[model samples]
Target: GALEERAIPIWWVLVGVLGGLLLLTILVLAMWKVGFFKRNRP
Candidate 1:
């Protein structure tokens, strides 16, 4: 019973990690496309 109860939380953790990675990837791609990290020079 204890182990079974713990499984649900572990699944949620995995899902949260994957979701975070996906969001980060999208953010980085969009920033790169818009040159957010570029230097402003005279």
Candidate 2:
């Protein structure tokens, strides 16, 4: 029963990490599209 109780929080941590990675990837792509990295180009 102790192991079962521990598993739920572990699963939540994994889900949170994955969600954060997915969000960061989308944010980076959106910034790329908006020329966030090309502001100094000639």
Candidate 3:
């Protein structure tokens, strides 16, 4: 606790937690499988 608290929108975190992460994770998982980084040829 502090004398001055910086408050953010309550709904903003909720919106980010669910849709921005859970659903958005699908795209990143695909990118991971697609090899966005340096890789070795086999």
Candidate 4:
């Protein structure tokens, strides 16, 4: 009963990983939009 109660679905793990990736991408895009890491032009 304990093992069964503690079992987790594979989809739950996948969804969490995907959600993290999406959040990271959004942050990178926002920084780029603000020119936070833009390269200097000649």
Report, for every candidate in turn, its global Cα lDDT versus the true structure. Answer: 0.84, 0.84, 0.77, 0.89
Candidate 4 has what TM-score? 0.70
Per-candidate TM-score against the hidden true structure: 0.62, 0.65, 0.38, 0.70
lDDT of 4 by residue, 1-42 (tens): 566576487779899999999999999999999999898999
Error of 1 at 30 (Å): 0.3
Top lDDT model: 4
lDDT of 3 by residue, 23-42 (tens): 77898788888898548888
| Model 1 lDDT tens row, 1-42 | 565443566778989999999999999999988988777899
RMSD (CA, Å), each prediction = 3.0, 2.7, 6.5, 3.7
* lDDT against true structure, model 2: 0.84
Better of 3 and 4 by lDDT: 4
Task: Give every collision pair in model 4.
Answer: none
Candidate number with the higher TM-score (1 or 3): 1
The better candidate by lDDT, 1 or 3, is: 1
Deviation of model 2 at 40, angstroms: 7.2
Clashes of 3: 0
Best by TM-score: 4
Model 1 scores worst on lDDT over the 10 consecutive residues at: 1-10
RMSD of 1: 3.0
